[PDB]
Design a binder for this molecule. Structure first.
Ligand SMILES: *C(=O)[C@H]1N[C@@](C)(CO)[C@](O)([C@H](Cc2ccc(F)cc2F)NC(=O)[C@H](Cc2ccc(F)cc2)NC(=O)[C@@H](CC(=O)N(CC)CC)NC(=O)CCCCC)O[C@H]1C
Lengths: 230, 212, 208, 210, 211, 204, 195, 195, 204
């Protein structure tokens, strides 16, 4: 609320065929100490939406309670799968929250990504939802996908690839050089690994113990964390 | 010790005629020395015969445009007729002055066509002052393009003079001006949307500029 | 500090023809002028001209320093001095007070002689307040009204041009730039040098 | 640079048309005189948005008072209302500078109002960057019982000379005339360029030196 | 501004953009950041361009005098020493960060100079506002013992990546190839309304014919 | 100030220094070790003890169910099976809320320790501002813990005995006291287990 | 603070300035003589600012110009006097600043009757007319209005009387007493005025 | 800035103040009326400071005193008027300060002719004589010198004439025009003076 | 920045990180590891190398006398018996003088390492300002050495072997790199002995 203390590094989000891919290093640095090297920095609101994080951890946690409990209220007044809120809804909600906190001058020292799938014609997961506990992938049109961004100042937009932190110079350059449309999972993961390798080799606050999450027709898939090949 | 003001940067160009108004703007968002995305339209359509463009903080212009569209839709619902451009101009003046002491970082241009088929153009500051014009520009490139519009439209410091102007020449002049701004300013953009308004509705085209 | 005595200078090139122009204002306390003859252009050699924009005392002091150095150079060498040599020497003088500098953003406009008959090549360049030289090969602008002039010249520049069309182009660019600046204006002068002759003209500007 | 003085056939009000964001002019044509009432005008100076919004608010309140009481308001009451509301925003950042002039039941009256609640009654006023030049030329050549033509000529020349030594002031001159039955616009807008080359440089030979 | 340097097979390749800014505007669209020190040493940097120009001319002419006195091939480490002493003596206020490159008797070696007087030999580097965009793709694609053509293509990958990304950098891309014998300077490497006569008014005229 | 917490087999340990009683008993199965400002920490300790008594009363079911010197004290739990003792996740998260809503003033890093039936021995690290991370291996805070960060990383094992963790945490705080200047006095250690908690102090 | 006014035309020059010695909130005198500095030959220097600064600078410039004229046995040109004063003021500005305004005037055979404005930061340029101080605002537009070519000395004194009346009536420091210094027909006439 | 002078003796009271409406470096007028505030009954309030502060405070105090007199149907005592003004000024000082000096004067049956000094921080006390502004320095010692018991109104006006002559001659703002307000023999006489 | 120096039997070792070549060769028998500002340290390194060459020339007698990857280099001493190589006490004390006379600007902590005939292997620690202390056990500097202070204190022995000190210093810098955020890259290590010096780097 007054300044950053415990900081995360950066996240990368890209859309491809069958869904989107979002990645983040599991580390939160206490300045120049690196106290925590196993932190969950990618969160889930519901199926077909996730929340990114690069900044102060307390604000991300507060926004995580707000967003996940907004999803709880959505489920508690749900009757059909189409009544589930889209990533546009949550992205606008975070944008309004950041704008209001800016006007009050009590900001959140974070740079959020909201991304997922803004359509329901591809899977029947949301008709009978499963919060606690939990085929072939179905190709998803890029128009039905969505990736968004929220700045400290509330600035927002949408694009096929969005990154935060120091990845907005390194990884954004690699994506603008190399990002195609409808790349398979292997090519996307190779590109993400190359960008995170370049970040690890030239960013103190980053690391190699990477978390990777996917948002597809099957739903949100928290894969096993892996150390980068380097 | 946090300053809630950043110039995302941009430019919006406006020009009028006998029975039309041309408004053009970039489609680049950015930060100080880096670009977020290559497509972020700042022009928001308000009515069938009115649009608004802006430059400055992206969040402030989005909130202002959506709030103004809310007020316009409530006005149509309560009063059963669309508001005129002068009405929208005074409403935006009152909205801007409501936040006098924490002002919007938004330099606005309000274009449209009056009920008498006259292309109007209002230009704003951050606080709320406004005045009708036949040519205006705001944003980072405002100092660049504004002398050029003064040379073309007003055409003072000239003796031979030529007032024969039509829609195509005005559009081409706007394309030349925004291209010159893109060459001569770093925040300007890479693709621009030339909104054109006429008695027969609204048309919108797109043009590709330099990517630097 | 440059709002105090706001000023502007300009210079274009063409086909065996070069132009330089300036405003004639001298300010005091930003928003009140005191003279409408203070020329920022100073003749220095038969085919070299210099346009100094900034604080008036620094403009004058730099003019006398450069005139001292120039007239020393022609008297010792006993021959006319080149534009590049004057530009480099100007950059050295502006750098020699890197700390506590002369608050002036000058330009240089003239002709380059290539002996063999002789060919007059146009030459134009601009400087920061330290001597950050940058050859340009076309329109060069410097002062508080620099942005407006940059906007005007690209719309109005037509590459190589006749001296009459060059005078119309540079005059319209300067007049449109000065009208949009409150602290710069109050008349103008346009010097159009050619190898045969130089034409000096003053414009019926919005001097009020 | 605003201007206002009182004479035999009412009141003459004159203003410039420049508008500055600092060293750069936003617009060369504006309107600094608002019909607050059919019989009352008010000039505008300082912060543009502040003065514009507050004279329009005062016009609203005047319409309330006249429509309730069915009597035209005086200039003193409007000036008092303006100075009271502006004093509520003291120490906030307002820079309103206003000269209110009009005809009422008492007679021809004129008031000056500032952001600090500075209500001052008089017969000659001028606010802006070029206020001193206009004051100097009027007090050199202002008299009571002079004709309307002389009055508009004097106001136009004063606004010209204020623009001459003020970059902030410029554009066009708008000289209005207030009388018993409302007001008329003697000069809607007239360029200072031909004004200069009529007054100070009638012969278009050589730059004028000063 | 974007600058880069690279060490290759018995050669060094430098690269830079061709744009300079005077705030949010652009003054020169075809500037020259690359500067000549010696026949086998070149440089390019970012900061106050007056400081860069004067310091580079000083280093160039001092190296020329040192070569003439000693009659030996100039060395890059000597230029590093003169620059580091020059920037350390003036307290770091002369903000001019320079990418130094050359090919001396000890083979090719690139150097990176900083404002405060520190230095470090590196195989590759980039400086300026658009440094990170360029040098990311450099380390993505950099290898040891390239061919010269691969080095030039990678240099256009870096400087053309920074031109498209960074707002403070743009224009043409410069390349210079430095070698033990000879050099090459490819200045344009890649490269990615008339008024009538008497239109303006006047009130004075005076023709002075030139003798 | 040095603060250390270590999870070992069937239990959890905590430690501090005595320089300016940093461990505070919120509940029988729940102890918290305080770092940072004394006044801020003591105020939030009073408030969190108030909240713990509130939920401990509230979550009670209705009817009948389940038919140098190493001077030490032992306190067996009154509540067997953890029927109504609150959960350490809950108390840690309301503590996170309290520090976050008042982070402009409150500057205190707290590390929590207790045993729960649902998730067994736990260790939560409340940082400056409202940041909470569950540490499965060990937790550190205070100035003196900065120097023993690699020592703890080296000598920690996955499933440690009571004596192993005793000697490791004691040598850890001793090395922090030796290196760090603002830590000293008798060392206090608290071992929290499934069925009891034992408090023992070391004067060396 | 200290008002200085100057006017120049064909075959005359006039200078003027208030006669007041301000200290804190009072006047040491109403008949000051520290502002004008007569130079040998048809020349003068009128200074405005703090008393000590104008005393040191005016005496230094006057006595150096006298040294030049005695060593060289010739009358210094007015343009040389003005630019020498500017160079000295600029040099002292860069090291030991003299917060003092200037109004250089004189007569020369080669240039004729001429005047030079000059600010406290040595912002110097030839002018037909000018002023200094806060009173420059309230008298310069009068000088624009009533100045014309082929003027006479009496018309100029009428303009100065108008400016003094304006400074008494409207300017905050209602300055009453003034001292003039007229150059015309190879004479230097001084007058004292009380409006 | 704004000079206020006041004198009180047996069977008279005099107030005085300059008539000037200062804005920046000029005068809006030379015949100001915003400083004096006539109260119903033999009472007055003379204010000095910024124009808006004295306008708001003087109108507020005057119209509340009028409200008291109309509701109660009796003339407010002078001492009550002075201390009420002080309490209002102190209350507004603690929250929304009014940088304005005061000189309360009037006539009462029980206390007679009396005067009260009061500063901008509500530093109030009865006095036979006093002054405000920078001109208080240059007129208060005159008032000590030429005041004596059993004075008359003409002698007081002579003293005020001496003070006005001193303010014209020696004080930096050479104030010429003044307005007086004499209370004597159950009358309130106003005069305008130009030395 | 992490900097570590350890005295073992018949030799001495040094170590650093590679993030911003921190070890600098003043002389064959004399190496110095730099911490703090890069420019300040490099300037004083140039000056102290100048002074070392000066005294090394000056103290020469007249006539004849004495009739992951562990990629490594070895440099045998040219001067046997240490006839004219300067003393590390002398170079360290003039370095102390240089930092002290310019301590208002110079902010750099340097640790020195070399072998001398008079006093054998030595290790001098030049701190911020002009403070010099001879460390017989070990020396530390930089941000990353703060975390391994207790690890070095625990695992140091009086008379260590070359391999023991190799593994200890390598694990020390690895733990400092792991904990500290501003340290990384390949580890550089220099072993200085009676008759040779060997430079070897570790990429892990
Ligand atoms: C006479 O002396 C004359 N001088 C000027 C022209 C000097 O600026 C001005 O003061 C003018 C008033 C004005 C302008 C336009 C208009 F339609 C009505 C009007 F009354 N003053 C200004 O324009 C402002 C300068 C200023 C003065 C004092 C202050 F304390 C602050 C500012 N400038 C503006 O109002 C400007 C933006 C603004 O609000 N600012 C500056 C950033 C303050 C927050 N707005 C415009 O110029 C018009 C809208 C934009 C058109 C594209 O008038 C008389 C006295």
């Amino acid at each position: 609320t007054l300044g950053p203390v415990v900081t995360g590094t950066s996240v990368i989000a890209i859309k491809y065929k069958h869904g989107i891919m979002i990645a983040a290093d599991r580390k939160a640095s206490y300045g120049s100490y690196a106290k925590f090297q196993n932190v969950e920095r990618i969160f889930k609101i519901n199926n077909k939406t996730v929340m990114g994080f690069s900044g102060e951890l307390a604000d991300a946690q507060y926004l995580h309670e707000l967003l996940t409990r907004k999803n709880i209220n959505n489920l508690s007044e749900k009757k059909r799968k189409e009544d589930m809120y889209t990533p546009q809804h949550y992205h606008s909600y975070v944008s309004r929250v950041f704008y209001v906190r800016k006007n009050r001058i009590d900001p959140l020292f974070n740079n959020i990504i909201i991304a997922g799938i803004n359509s329901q014609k591809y899977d029947n997961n949301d008709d009978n939802v499963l919060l606690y506990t939990n085929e072939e992938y179905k190709e998803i049109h890029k128009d039905d996908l969505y990736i968004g961004f929220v700045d400290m100042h509330g600035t927002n937009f949408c694009d096929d690839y969005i990154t935060t932190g120091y990845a907005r110079y390194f990884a954004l350059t690699l994506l603008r050089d190399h990002y195609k449309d409808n790349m398979t999972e292997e090519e996307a993961r190779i590109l993400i690994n190359e960008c995170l390798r370049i970040l690890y080799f030239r960013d103190a606050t980053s690391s190699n113990f990477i978390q990777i999450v996917k948002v597809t027709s099957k739903g949100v898939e928290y894969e096993e964390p892996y150390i980068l090949p380097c | 010790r946090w300053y809630p003001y950043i110039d995302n940067g941009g430019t919006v160009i406006g020009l009028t005629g006998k029975d039309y108004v041309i408004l053009a703007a970039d489609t680049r968002l950015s930060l100080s020395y880096s670009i977020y995305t290559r497509f972020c339209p700042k022009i928001s359509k308000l009515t069938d015969k009115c649009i608004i463009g802006s430059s400055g903080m992206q969040s402030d212009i989005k909130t202002l445009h959506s709030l103004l569209q809310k007020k316009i839709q409530l006005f149509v619902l309560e009063h059963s007729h669309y508001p005129d451009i002068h009405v929208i101009a005074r409403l935006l003046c009152v909205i801007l002055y409501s936040r006098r002491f924490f002002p919007y970082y938004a330099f606005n241009i309000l274009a449209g066509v009056d009920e008498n088929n006259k292309g109007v153009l209002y230009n704003y500051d951050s606080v709320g002052s406004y005045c009708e014009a036949t040519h205006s520009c705001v944003g980072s490139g405002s100092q660049l393009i504004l002398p050029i519009l003064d040379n073309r439209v007003e055409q003072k410091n000239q003796l031979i003079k030529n007032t024969n102007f039509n829609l195509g020449d005005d559009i081409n002049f706007v394309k030349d001006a925004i291209t010159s701004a893109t060459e001569r300013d770093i925040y300007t953009g890479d693709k621009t949307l030339i909104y054109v308004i006429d008695k027969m509705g609204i048309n919108v085209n797109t043009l590709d500029l330099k990517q630097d | 500090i440059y709002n105090y005595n706001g000023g502007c200078v300009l210079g274009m090139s063409g086909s065996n023809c070069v132009a330089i122009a300036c405003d004639l204002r001298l300010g005091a306390n930003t928003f009140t002028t005191v003279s409408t003859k203070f020329s920022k252009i100073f003749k220095m050699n038969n085919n070299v001209y210099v346009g100094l924009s900034g604080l008036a005392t620094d403009i004058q002091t730099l003019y006398e320093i450069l005139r001292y150095r120039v007239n020393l150079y022609e008297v010792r060498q006993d021959a006319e001095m080149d534009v590049e040599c004057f530009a480099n020497m100007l950059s050295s003088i502006l750098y020699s007070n890197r700390f506590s500098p002369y608050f002036v953003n000058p330009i240089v406009v003239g002709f380059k002689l290539k002996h063999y008959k002789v060919n007059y090549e146009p030459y134009l360049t601009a400087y920061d307040l330290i001597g950050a030289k940058c050859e340009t090969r076309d329109f060069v602008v410097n002062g508080v009204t620099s942005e407006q002039l940059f906007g005007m010249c690209e719309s109005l520049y037509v590459k190589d041009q006749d001296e009459n069309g060059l005078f119309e182009t540079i005059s319209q660019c300067l007049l449109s730039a000065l009208d949009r600046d409150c602290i710069s204006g109050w008349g103008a002068e346009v010097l159009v040098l050619t190898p045969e002759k130089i034409i000096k003209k003053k414009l019926k500007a919005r001097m009020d | 640079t605003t201007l206002a003085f009182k004479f035999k056939d009412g009141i003459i009000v004159a203003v410039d048309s420049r508008a500055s964001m600092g060293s750069f002019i936003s617009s060369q044509n504006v309107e600094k005189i608002i019909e607050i009432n059919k019989n009352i005008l008010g000039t505008m100076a300082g912060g543009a948005a502040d003065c514009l919004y507050w004279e329009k608010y005062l016009g609203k309140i005047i319409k309330i008072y006249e429509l309730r009481n069915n009597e035209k308001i005086s200039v003193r009451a409007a000036s008092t209302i303006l100075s009271n509301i502006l004093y509520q925003y003291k120490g906030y950042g307002l820079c309103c500078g206003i000269i209110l002039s009009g005809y009422d039941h008492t007679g021809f009256n004129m008031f000056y109002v500032d952001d600090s609640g500075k209500k001052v009654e008089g017969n000659l006023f001028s606010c802006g960057s070029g206020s001193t030049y206009a004051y100097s030329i009027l007090d050199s050549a202002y008299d009571y019982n002079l004709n309307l033509d002389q009055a508009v000529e004097l106001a136009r020349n004063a606004i010209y000379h204020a623009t001459f030594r003020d970059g902030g002031s410029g554009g066009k001159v708008r000289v209005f005339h207030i009388h018993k039955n409302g007001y008329d616009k003697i000069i809607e807008g007239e360029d200072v360029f031909d004004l200069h080359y009529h007054y100070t440089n009638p012969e278009q030979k050589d730059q004028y030196v000063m | 501004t974007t600058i880069c340097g690279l060490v290759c097979q018995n050669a060094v390749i430098l690269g830079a953009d061709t744009r300079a800014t005077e705030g949010p505007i652009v003054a020169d669209k075809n500037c020259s950041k690359l500067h000549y020190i010696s026949k086998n040493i070149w440089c390019a940097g970012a900061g106050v361009a007056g400081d860069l120009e004067h310091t580079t001319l000083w280093l160039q002419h001092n190296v020329e005098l040192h070569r003439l006195n000693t009659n030996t091939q100039p060395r890059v480490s000597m230029c590093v020493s003169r620059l580091t002493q020059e920037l350390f003596k003036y307290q770091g206020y002369k903000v001019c960060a320079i990418v130094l490159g050359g090919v001396d008797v000890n083979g090719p070696q690139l150097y990176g100079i900083h404002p405060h007087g520190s230095s470090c030999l590196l195989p590759f580097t980039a400086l300026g506002s658009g440094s990170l965009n360029a040098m990311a793709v450099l380390e993505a694609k950099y290898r040891d013992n390239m061919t010269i053509e691969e080095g030039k293509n990678l240099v256009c990958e870096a400087i053309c990546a920074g031109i498209f990304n960074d707002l403070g950098s743009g224009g043409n891309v410069d390349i210079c190839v430095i070698t033990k014998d000879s050099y090459q300077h490819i200045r344009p490497y890649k490269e990615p309304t008339i008024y009538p006569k008497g239109t303006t008014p006047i009130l004075s005229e005076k023709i002075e014919y030139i003798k | 100030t040095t603060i250390i917490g270590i999870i070992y087999d069937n239990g959890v340990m905590l430690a501090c220094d005595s320089r300016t009683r940093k461990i505070n008993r919120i509940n029988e199965n729940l102890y918290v070790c305080r770092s940072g400002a004394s006044a801020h920490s003591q105020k939030i300790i009073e408030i969190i003890k108030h909240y713990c008594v509130s939920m401990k009363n509230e979550n009670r079911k209705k009817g009948r169910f389940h038919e140098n010197l190493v001077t030490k004290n032992k306190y067996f739990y009154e509540d067997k099976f953890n029927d109504y003792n609150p959960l350490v996740e809950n108390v840690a998260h309301i503590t996170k809320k309290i520090i976050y809503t008042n982070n402009n003033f409150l500057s205190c890093a707290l590390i929590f320790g207790g045993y729960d039936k649902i998730k067994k021995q736990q260790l939560y690290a409340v940082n400056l501002n409202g940041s909470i991370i569950e540490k499965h291996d060990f937790a550190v805070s205070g100035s003196g813990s900065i120097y023993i960060q690699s020592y703890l990383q080296d000598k920690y094992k996955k499933f440690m005995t009571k004596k192993e963790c005793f000697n490791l945490i004691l040598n850890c705080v001793k090395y922090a006291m030796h290196n760090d200047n603002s830590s000293g006095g008798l060392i206090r250690i608290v071992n929290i287990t499934k069925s009891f908690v034992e408090e023992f102090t070391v004067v060396n | 603070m200290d008002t200085l006014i100057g006017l120049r035309g064909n075959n005359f020059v006039v200078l003027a300035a208030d006669t007041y010695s301000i200290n804190s909130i009072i006047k040491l005198k109403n008949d000051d003589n520290t502002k004008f500095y007569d130079i040998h030959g048809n020349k003068c220097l009128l200074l405005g600012g703090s008393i000590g600064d104008r005393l040191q600078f005016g005496e230094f410039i006057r006595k150096n110009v006298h040294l030049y004229q005695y060593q060289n046995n010739t009358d210094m040109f007015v343009k040389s006097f003005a630019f020498f004063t500017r160079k000295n003021l600029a040099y002292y500005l860069r090291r030991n600043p003299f917060e003092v305004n200037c109004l250089i005037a004189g007569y020369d055979k080669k240039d004729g009757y001429q005047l030079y404005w000059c600010d406290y930061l040595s912002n110097m340029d030839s002018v037909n007319k000018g002023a200094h101080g806060y009173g420059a605002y309230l008298v310069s537009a009068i000088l624009d209005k009533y100045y014309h070519e082929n003027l006479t000395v009496d018309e100029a004194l009428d303009i100065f009387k108008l400016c003094f009346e304006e400074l008494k009536k409207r300017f905050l420091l209602t300055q009453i007493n003034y001292e003039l210094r007229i150059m015309y027909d190879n004479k230097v006439e001084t007058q004292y005025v009380t409006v």
